[PDB]
Amino acid sequence: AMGAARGAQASGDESASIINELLVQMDGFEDNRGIVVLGATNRPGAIDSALIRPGRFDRIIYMPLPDALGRAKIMQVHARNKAVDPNINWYEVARAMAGFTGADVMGLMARAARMAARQGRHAITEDDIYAAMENKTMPDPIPPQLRRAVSVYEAGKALLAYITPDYEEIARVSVCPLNVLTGFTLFVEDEDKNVNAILTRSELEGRMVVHLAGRCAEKLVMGEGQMTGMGSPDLFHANLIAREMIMSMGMGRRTGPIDLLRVAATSEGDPFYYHTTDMSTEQARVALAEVVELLDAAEAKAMYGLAINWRALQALTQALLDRGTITGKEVAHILESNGVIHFPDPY
Amino acid sequence: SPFYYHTTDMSTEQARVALAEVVELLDAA
Amino acid sequence: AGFTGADVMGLMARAARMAARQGRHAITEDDIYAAMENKTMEATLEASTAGDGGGLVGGEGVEGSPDPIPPQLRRAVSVYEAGKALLAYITPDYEE
Amino acid sequence: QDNVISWSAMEILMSRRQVDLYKQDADMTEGAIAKLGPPPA
Amino acid sequence: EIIFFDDIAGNKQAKVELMEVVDFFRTPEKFKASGARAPKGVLLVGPPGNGKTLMARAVAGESGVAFISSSAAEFIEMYMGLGAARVRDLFNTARSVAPCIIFIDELDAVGRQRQGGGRSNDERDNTVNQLLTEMDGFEAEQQGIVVMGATNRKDVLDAALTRPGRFDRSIEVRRPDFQGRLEAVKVHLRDKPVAAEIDYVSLASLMGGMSGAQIAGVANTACFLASRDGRSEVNQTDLTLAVEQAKYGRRFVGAGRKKRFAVMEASIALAATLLPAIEPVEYATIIPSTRSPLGRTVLKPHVGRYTTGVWTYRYLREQLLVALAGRAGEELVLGRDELSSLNQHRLQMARQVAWKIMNSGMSSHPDYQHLRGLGSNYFDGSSEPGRFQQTTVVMDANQTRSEAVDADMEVEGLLNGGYKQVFELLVRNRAALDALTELLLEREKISGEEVVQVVEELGHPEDLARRAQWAGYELL
Amino acid sequence: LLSFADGNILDEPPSPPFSSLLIPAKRFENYKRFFRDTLTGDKMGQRKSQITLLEKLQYHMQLRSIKQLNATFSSNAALTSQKLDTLMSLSTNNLLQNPTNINWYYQNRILKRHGQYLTNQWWNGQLSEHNAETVFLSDIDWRSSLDVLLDFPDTDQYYN
Amino acid sequence: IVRMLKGDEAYKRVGAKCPKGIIFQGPPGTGKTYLARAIAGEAEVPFFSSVGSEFVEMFAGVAAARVNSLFYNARKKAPAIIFIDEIDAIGRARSTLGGDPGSMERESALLAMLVQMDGIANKTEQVLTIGATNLAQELDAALLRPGRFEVVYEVPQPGPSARMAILRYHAKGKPLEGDGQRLLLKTAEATQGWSAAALANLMNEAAILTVRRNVPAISLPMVLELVEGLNWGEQAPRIPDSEAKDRLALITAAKAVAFALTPGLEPIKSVTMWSGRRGLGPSVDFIAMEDKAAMDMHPEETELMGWRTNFKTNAAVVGDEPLGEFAHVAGLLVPLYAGRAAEVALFGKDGASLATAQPLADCFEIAYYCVRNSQVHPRFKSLPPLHTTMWLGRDDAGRWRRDPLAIGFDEELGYHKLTLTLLKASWRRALRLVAQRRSAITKVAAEMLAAPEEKITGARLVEIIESTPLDDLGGEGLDGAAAAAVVEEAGNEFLPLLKEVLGQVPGIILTG
Amino acid sequence: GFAVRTALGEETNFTAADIKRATRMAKKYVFYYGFSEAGGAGITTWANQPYSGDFVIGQQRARKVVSTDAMDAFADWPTVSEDFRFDAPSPSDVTWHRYTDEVRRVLKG
Amino acid sequence: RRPNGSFKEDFFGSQRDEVHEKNQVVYQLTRHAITHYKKPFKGDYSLAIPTNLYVTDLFLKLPTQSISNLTNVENHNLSIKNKIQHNKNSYLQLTQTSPFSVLLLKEEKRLKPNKIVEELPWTSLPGEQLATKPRTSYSVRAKVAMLAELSLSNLSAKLDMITDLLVIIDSVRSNKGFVVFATTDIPHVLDPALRRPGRLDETI
Ligand SMILES: Nc1ncnc2c1ncn2[C@@H]1O[C@H](COP(=O)(O)OP(=O)(O)NP(=O)(O)O)[C@@H](O)[C@H]1O
Ligand SMILES: Nc1ncnc2c1ncn2[C@@H]1O[C@H](COP(=O)(O)OP(=O)(O)NP(=O)(O)O)[C@@H](O)[C@H]1O
C-alpha cells in the first residue's frame, strides 16, 4: 500500500514523499541498532525499484501452500483454545483438504463449530468437519457386447501392468461406472518418483508393451473384425515412446547418435510440446523402418505375455463382467489365485 | 520488426531460371 | 563525403584519442584515417557481440576469443586482405 | 529384417501382396506407381 | 404540445400494447379481478426516424399524467459523479410528482456493457449502476411509475438493464407498412393545401422503404416546390416528382461517356429479355445517382426464389451470361481497343457466380459432381439475428494437389465459354441492340414494356422461338 | 535470406497493428476451427474433438434432475451423487476409453445444423444500386416490396 | 446466522463465531436484493441500506467522510446490519493507470471502507456487513482478505424443482384453468435457462393477457405461446404459396423419410414447415431431455444404439447383428444426400438447387473421419500399430507441428481415393432409396402442406412410411439419366464374393 | 530507363524505378480490369481489388493530387464494408504460371 | 527508436506522392543498400543494408534449416502464425471460500488469444441464456474486434521522447567538473540520433 512503485497515483507529492522518507530512515543517517522492519505483502513484484536495492530491503521470504502434515499441524495448533473432541485423529481428514490454505483451514474449523452449534451440541465432534464440506457443496442400460469389449480391454491392460517389473501399482479398474459409458485403469500416483533419474531402455520397452496390451487382448479374444477405436490414446503414447527412443536418445543402430526431437514445456491444453527438425526422405525412411520394427516387436511380446496367462485373463475378465469395479488389492488377489506368471528381470 | 528479408511469389519454373542466372553471374565473377 | 560539421568535430576528438594511443600529442593524418577505421570497426563489433552470441572479436581472454591471435590465423587474414586490395587496384575506375 | 529400404512408405509397412492390391489408390503419378510391387510392371 | 394515439400512424401492435398500459395507468378497471400487477417499464426498439418519441408523448397524454422526458445528452459528462446525481434527481422528483412517466432517449450511448475499455468507464458505468438502483434497487417500490426508454438496438444494452423486472415490456417499431404508409401520408395532408384528385394507393405502393420522417420530408418538399412554382396546390404528378427526387437522387456527364452507359444498359436488358430463365425487366436508366456512378437495369423480384431459396442450376448459368453481357456489348459496339473500367464489379460478380457453382456441388468433374463442395463450411453470426456468413477452408486434407488445377480450369472454362456464348448472342441480335440504345439515349429512362416490345419486333426469329417455348412456366 | 511463399494466401494486406483491417484475422479464426475439428483435436491423443467427461456427467445430471422434479412433485440419492462427483474428480487422466464418436456428429452436425434450414441463400445481381454494399449502406431501404421481405446474403469467404 | 446474531445463547456455548462479512454474487435476476429485504424484515435490528455510487460527488474527501459517518453511526447503534448493494462501483480493484480525480476519490473511499471494516478488532462489535454484486471479478483482493469479507455466497439460477417452486409461489392469487399442477410442471420443464424475475414476469403478463382477450383463467397453449414469443420475439409469417414451395416441401419430405429409415438414430418428434422464426425454414426435430426422461432412455442412447442387436427406432430395424461405428456413422451420409437425390431423380441436373447444397457440402468431413481418424476401417486394421496421423502439440505462440517422419503418408496410403469411394457408394444408396420410396415422399409432402399448422408428427410420419408399398424402379418419372444409375446392381454383400474366391481351390465343396 | 540506356549505351539502376511501377500497372491490366487475352477472353479466375485508404493509419499534407497515379486512381471504386468483400481462391502455381506469363507478354510488347 | 513501407501502394492505393519523389527514393535506396556496406558514418547501425542483418544472424543465432517435405504446414514444420499479436530427455518427466471462487472466476473471465471459438446452434440460445456467455467466446467478429482494439491502443502509447532527451544530453558539455555514465544492455535498440558525435560516442 505504501511500497507501490513509481508512476503510482501521485504527481510527485504524497507517495513520492513517503517513499523518500522510508529511504532516508532506512539509509541516510541510520542509527538503526536492533531495529528490524518486517514488511509484509503478497505481490512483491509491485514494490518500487528504489526499495529493494542492497541495504534497504534484500531478504525476501516465501511461504508456500501447506501440505498434509502442514495443515494437520495447523488443525492441531488451532485446537488449543477451543472445545474440540478430546482426541481425534485428523491427518487423514487433512487429506480431504487438498488445495486449501491456512485461512481456509481456520474458516473450515469455524464452519464446523457453527455446524455443531446448529445440532445443539456444545461439543464439536468430528462429523462437523465433514459437515462443512457438505454444506459448501449445495437392469442394464449397456448392451452385452459393449460390456464384453470394454471389460476385455481393461482386463488385458491391468494384467500386463501387473506382471511387468517396476511398473506402478493399480489403484482401480472400472468398466462403465454409474452406467456412464467409459472405462479406465487408474495407477497410484506417488511423490517418491524422482524425475531426474534417467530412463533405461528396458523401462521404456516395458511401458510400450503395457500400452499395446489392451489392443492385443481385444484382438486375441474377440477377433480383428470386432476391434473398436477405444484404444487410441494408448496407441498414441506407444508411438510417442517409440519415436523418442529413436530420434532423441540415439538407440537406433542405423540412425546413429543424431538428435532430431526435443521435448519442451509450455508456459505454465497440454503440459508439453516438441521441437522437430526438417529431415530428408532418406533419413526419414531410415528412421521409420526402425520405429516400425520396435512397434512390431512390442506387439509380439504383448501377445505372448497374454497368451501364457490365459487362465488369469479369463478369471479377471469374468470378475469385471460381474462386479463392474475392482481395486488394486482385489485384482492382485484374483491374479495370484489363478497362477500368474511374471516376466523375468535380467538386471 | 527464421529471418527473411525478401519475398517472392513467382512460379517455380521462373524461380529455376532466375536462380540459374544468378549462379552463372557468380561463376563469371 | 556526406559529413556535416558535427561529424568533423567528432572525428577530430576521436583523432585526439587515436593519437594518444600511439604515444603522441599532436594529431597527424594517419591518426585521422585511424579514427575513421576505428569508428567503422567499433560499429560492426558492437552489433555482432550482443548476448550469448559473439565469435568475431579476438582478444578478450574468455573462452571464445584467444589472447594473442595465433599466427597461423594472421597469415590467413594477410592473404585475404592482400588479394582484395590487389584486385581493387587493377580494376579500372574503382574507388581509391 | 530388411537391409534395403525403399523410397516409399507403402513398401515399408505393407506386404507385397497388399501393395500389389492397393497401389492403385495412391495419390502419385503413373510413373511412380509403376515402380512399386512386382518389377514386372 | 399534447399528442394522442390517433395522431400516430400504424404500429397497431405498439398501440395495442401501449394501450394496456394506458388502461392500467388511468383506469385500473379489471386487473384486480385478473390479479395482475402493473408493468413498470417498456422498451421501444426500432430504427431512428420512426418516431419513438411522440409515442411516449401520446401515451402520457391519453393517460393524462406528468411527462418529464430527458435524454442522455445531459447524462454524459466527465466530472465527478454528476451522472448519478442527475439520475437521482430525475428519479426522486418523479417519485415526488408521482404518478408519472419517465421517458429517456439516448440509452444505447450510455447503457453499454460494463467493462474496462477506456478510462471513462470508471465514471460511465458508475452512472449506469445508479440507474440500476432506481428502477428496482432497494426501497422495494416507490409507486409503480412507468419508465420508458428509446434505443436503436437492444443487443447492445447491458445485461442487467434488459432483464424482466426492470423493463417488463419490449415492443418493436419497424418502418411503416403498406397501409401504414397509406395512413401516415394522408394524416400528413390536412396541414397541406391539396387538391381532390389524390389517390393515396399509388403513393403507398410507390414510397415503399422509407421512414416516417422521410414521408414528412416528402410533403415538405412538395409544399416548398409548389410555392417556388407559383401554384396553390399539389396533385398526382407533384408528389410523384417529390418522391422520385427523394429516392433516386438528383453533376455533368459528357456525350462520349453517355454512349457507354447506353450501350451497356441496352446489352444487359437485351440479354435479360432473351434468356428464358431470367425475370423480366422492370426499368432501365442511364442517369447516375449519388452512389452508383453508372446506369442500372432492375429486374422484377421473383418472390418464390427469394422466400424459399430454390435457385436452380439453369438459372445460375443464365445469371453468369447476364453478368458478362455488359462487357460483351461494349466490345461489340465500341471495338476491343475501347474496353473500359466500368465492368470491374460485374466481373467480380461473374467470378462469384462461377465459384458458387463449383462450391455448391454442381460441377461436372466426376469426383465433384454431386458429392462435394470445395472445402469445410463454417458459419458465423452477422450484424443481425438471422444473418449468417459462410466460410470455406481448403487445405491439403481435402484437395489432393491436382484437383486445384481442375477447379481453376473449370471455373475458367465457365467464365470464358459464357463470354463467347453471350457475345454470339448479341451478334445475332444487333438490330435490337442499336434500336434500344438509341431509344435509351433519347429518353434517359425506359420501362420493361417498351424493351419487350422493341425486342419482339426486332429480335432474331430463333431466339424469339426459344423465348416463346418457355414462356408460361413459373419456376425454371 | 529470401522466402518463396509456400503455404499461404497469395496477396494479403497487413493487420490491425499496421492497418486496422480485420478480414485476415476473421479468416484465420475459421482456419483454427478447422484444425481443431478435423486434424488434431484438443489434446494430444484424441481422434478429433470429443465430448469430454465433464459433459457426459452434465447430461447425466440434467436427466437425473428432470426425472426427480417430475416424479417427486407429481407424488438412493446421495450415493449416486457422491460417487458421481468422485467420478468428476478424474477429468484430466487423458487415458480414458471412449469407444465411439457419433455423439459429436449427432450434436454438432445435425442438431446445430442440417436439422434446420437457412432461407437467405442468393440473389439476382440486378439491384436498385450497382452493388450489394451500396444497397446495404444506402439511405433508406431496399428489402421491401403484402410487402414481403427480400434480402441478400453476405459474400462467401474462401481460404485455401 | 440471524439466530446467532440476536441472542444466540447456544452458539456462544461452543464459541461458534459469526462471519464478520458476507458477499452475495451471481448473475442478474437471481434474488440478491429480494433476499436482502427478507433478512432485513426478519432481522428486527437497525438496517442501513446504501449503494456504492452515492459516495463520489463534486468534491474531494466527501466519499471517505460519508463511509466514515455510515460505519461510525452503525457502530454506535450496534448490533446492526449494513447493506451496500452494488459495491462494484466502490469496491472496484485499484488499477495502476489513470491520473483522474475520480480514481482518487474512489480508492480513497475504498481505503476508508477497508480501515473501517477491519476496524472491528473489538470482536464484541456485532456489526454485520453484506454486499451484493454481479461483477465479482472486479473486486479488489484487499476486500476479500480474511477478517474483512470472510464468506461469499453464489446465487445460482434455479433448476427444475426450484423453478416449479417459484411458479407455485407466484401463482397464488391467479385463476388457473383445470389442474394447475400439470401446467406448472410443463412450464417448469419448458423454461430452461430462466431466472426468477423472468418467471415472475411471465406469470404477471399471463394474467394481463387473460383480461385483454376475455378468458377466465390461464391455460397451457396461451402460456406456451407467451414463453415462446418472449424467448424469440414476434412470430414471423408463413411462406407464401408458389411452385417453389412445392419443391421445398418435396426436398424436406425426402430429408425426413431418409432420417426415419437410417438404422440407429434417436426418435423423431415432429416435421415442421413453418418454424415461425426469421431466417429459418423447414426443420426436422428430435426428442429432447424431457421426452427422454418421460420415455426412460439412457442419456447417451444414440451411442449405445451402435451395439444393440434386435430393435426398432423410427422405421429401421436391426436384427441380432450390431453396427460397428463404421456402418453406424457411414449410415449418416444417406440422409444428407436425400434432398439432392430427390431433385436429381425428378428433374435432372437442371433441378439441382442451392437449397440442397449445404447438407451435401458437409459429407467429406464425416467420410474423412470414417476413413482416416476413426482407425476402424477394414483396410488399415491389419497393419503394424503405426500412427500415421500424429501432431505434436502447440507452443505458446499457438502453432501446431507435425510428426517429422510423415513425409508423404497421406499420398501413399490413399486416404483421398478411399473417401471418394465411400462418398460415391453413399450417393448410389441415396438414389436407390429415393427411387424406391417415391410415393411415400409424395404423400408426406402433400400431407404436411395441407396441415393445420403445416406440421406433422413423428408417429404419423412413421405410419406413412410403413403403410405404403415400395415402387418398382421402372422409370416412371426417374429423369431417364438417373434411371440408369438406379439399376446399378449394387453388389452389397460379401458371401457371394467369397464363394467366387473359394471356388478356385479344388478341395472345398460348398452347401447352403 | 530505356532512354538512359539507349543514350549512355549501358544499363543503370534507373530501370529499377520504372519496371516496379510498370509491373504494378501491368498486373492491374491483366487481373482486375481484364483487358488481356488470358484464357480466350480476358477474364481470369482471380483478381485483387483495392481497399479504401480509410483502413490505413493515415496522414495529412499540403500537396496537390499526383500527376497520374493519384489521378488515375479515380477509376477504381475500392471496397469499403468488410462483410461484402470478395476474394476468390488463390491460383494453383500452375495457373499462376500462365497468368504471370501473360503479364510478362504485356510488358515485353 | 522513434516511429519505409510500400504496402500502402499495393493494397490501399494511397499513392500520395509525386512520381519523381518515388523515383528518387528508389535510386537512393538501391545505391545505399549496395555501396554503403562498411563505410564510416554512412552505413552504420542501419537496417536497410541486408548484409548487416546477415552478419547479426550469422554470429547470434544458431544455424537455420531449410523447409520441410510435409503437407498441411506452412513451409517449415509449423502452422500459420497469428495475424494480430497480443534439460530433460522424454515426456515421462514432464507430467508431475473467498479466494477459491473469486480467483477462479477472475482468471476464467480473462481474454485468451489461443482459444478456438465455440459455435452456436443456428437457432441461437434463447434470449436471457445467451447473456450468461462472454461475447468473445462464440463470435469471431467480437473476438477479433477486441484483439484489434487492444493491439492498436497499446501501439498508440509510444509517445516519442527523443527530442527533450536529446537537448538535455547535449546540455552537459557546457558545464565543468563532472562525468556522466549511462549504462545499458541492448545498445542496438537505441536511436541513431543519440550515437551521433557529441552526445554518446565513447562506448565501453
Ligand atoms: N408513426 C409515425 N406516424 C407519423 N409520423 C411519424 C411516425 N414516426 C415518426 N414520425 C415523424 O417523425 C418525426 C419525428 O421523429 P423523431 O421522434 O424525432 O424520431 P426519433 O425517434 O427521435 N429518432 P431521431 O429524430 O433521429 O433522434 C416527425 O416528423 C413525425 O411526424
Ligand atoms: N427465492 C425466490 N422465490 C420467489 N421469488 C423470487 C425468489 N428470488 C427472487 N424472486 C423474485 O425475483 C424478483 C427479485 O429479484 P431481485 O431481488 O431483483 O434479484 P437480484 O439478484 O437482486 N437481481 P439484480 O439486482 O438485477 O442483480 C421478484 O420478482 C421476486 O419475487
Ligand SMILES: [Mg+2]
Ligand atoms: Mg439487486
